[PDB]
């Protein structure tokens, strides 16, 4: 099969910047390549076919170049809507194959997370389990860490973490962290603490609650 | 406009068959073009499965040849994917697409999980605190994906973050936060609306102060 090697895997850029995404094929494909655009969590739009031809209603800032085994998608003067995912596809040989994708993210000023902590609901407690939830919302840049303490003691296991794609309105990220214990273990301890570590401060943002309160 | 929409099961057991329908509107599948199935794996890698052409010729990825069939119904303007003997390796988001000059038309995609795990209805828990206030909903203990979650029946969409579901021990956890200006809630109610189609579940959880 033809291997499509697509670069870079991700890029962080500013509005008005120019970027090239490249695809290399493991065999000559004679310009039988398309470029696809994907909003994360959604589906695809055809941008270019036969290496260089714009689809209907694709702006002149998108261009394609290349021949043989090496091709590039260039976006000159990036706009806000352009910071999404891109994939190349070869249809020169069966089976048709895809590049591994490129994620484009927009640069933005630093923002500290807004941290919120939540005790288990009485409803959950009837089931014999207890979850403590922490949201770290609307931060930039993407790199963050979360840490749980139970009566002061770090707890790694039994936690589930999830994060969002870059926000389409303020270009931030968000994270949810859920610590789950048995009701018995939950009722053996007093304080529950979420700590967010982020470049925006040398000290953690700490949110806590006490059961005795 | 040409429009494509996938439909089919969200869950298939290992060694059973995965079968999807692509319903096409605004262009006839007998007029031109090839009518494709593509899937995207967890991790975002894309694979071309095969196509049926406007003239009914099929072409298949050799990796899937023993297990795949693509068919159509010209009276309904629909084409179909059948994938047999599935394994957990077949868990992916499935797309139908048109190939003509590149790939101009795509369905929305549909998640199919392959697993022997039991369909389980979610528990929906309120998240209420012990300038602005944050509330949330915790949807725990369900299988398979997807769930849909809204606040105030879709009327409250700004300041909402709904996080990707996490699988642990064959059950999912999903959470959503919503941030509003202080002293709105609780006089103005905040309710999370949760649907889990696979267990025919629908729950509205009104967030009460603690």
């Amino acid at each position: 099969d033809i291997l499509m090697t697509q670069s870079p895997v991700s890029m962080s850029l500013s509005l008005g910047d120019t970027v090239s995404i490249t695809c290399h094929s493991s065999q000559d494909i004679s310009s039988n390549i398309g470029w696809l655009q994907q909003a994360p969590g959604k589906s695809f739009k055809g941008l270019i076919y036969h290496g260089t031809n714009l689809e209907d209603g694709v702006p002149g800032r998108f261009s394609g170049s290349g021949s043989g085994a090496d091709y590039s998608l260039t976006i000159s003067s990036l706009s806000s809507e352009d910071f999404v995912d891109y994939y190349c596809v070869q249809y020169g040989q069966f089976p048709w194959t895809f590049g591994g994708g490129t994620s484009l993210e927009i640069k933005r000023a630093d923002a500290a997370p807004t941290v919120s902590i939540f005790p288990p609901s009485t409803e959950q407690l009837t089931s014999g389990g207890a979850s403590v939830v922490c949201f770290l919302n609307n931060f930039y840049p993407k790199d963050i860490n979360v840490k749980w303490k139970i009566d002061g003691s770090e707890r790694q296991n039994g936690v589930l973490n999830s994060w969002t794609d870059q926000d389409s309105k303020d270009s931030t990220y968000s994270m949810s962290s859920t610590l789950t214990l048995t009701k018995d273990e939950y009722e053996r301890h007093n304080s529950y603490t979420c700590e967010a570590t982020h470049k925006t401060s040398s000290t953690p943002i700490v949110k806590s609650f006490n059961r005795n309160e | 406009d040409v429009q494509l929409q996938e439909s089919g099961p969200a869950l298939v057991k290992p060694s059973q068959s995965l079968s999807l329908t692509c319903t096409v509107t605004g262009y006839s599948i007998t007029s031109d073009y090839a009518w494709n199935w593509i899937r995207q794996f967890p991790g975002n890698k894309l694979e071309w499965m095969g196509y049926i052409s406007y003239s009914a010729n099929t072409r298949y990825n050799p990796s899937l040849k023993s297990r795949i069939s693509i068919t159509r119904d010209t009276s309904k303007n629909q084409f179909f994917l059948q994938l047999n003997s599935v394994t957990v390796e077949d868990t992916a988001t499935y797309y139908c697409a048109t190939a003509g000059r590149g790939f101009p038309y795509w369905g929305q995609g549909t998640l199919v999980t392959v697993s022997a795990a039991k369909t389980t209805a979610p528990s929906v828990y309120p998240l209420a605190p012990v300038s602005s206030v944050t509330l949330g909903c915790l949807v725990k203990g369900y299988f398979p994906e997807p769930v849909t979650l809204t606040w105030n029946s879709g009327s409250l969409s700004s300041g909402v973050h709904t996080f990707p579901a996490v699988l642990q021990s064959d059950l999912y956890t999903l959470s959503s936060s919503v941030t509003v200006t202080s002293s709105t809630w609780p006089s103005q109610s905040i309710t999370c609306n949760v649907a889990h189609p696979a267990s025919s579940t629908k729950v509205d959880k009104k967030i009460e102060p603690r």
Binding site: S30, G92 | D32, A34, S55, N57
Partner: peptide, 16 residues
């Protein structure tokens, strides 16, 4: 399509 090629159609798919 490159100067060594022309656009053809196979199964409804245009290809160089």
């Amino acid at each position: 399509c490159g100067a060594d090629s022309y656009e053809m159609e196979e199964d409804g798919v245009r290809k160089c």
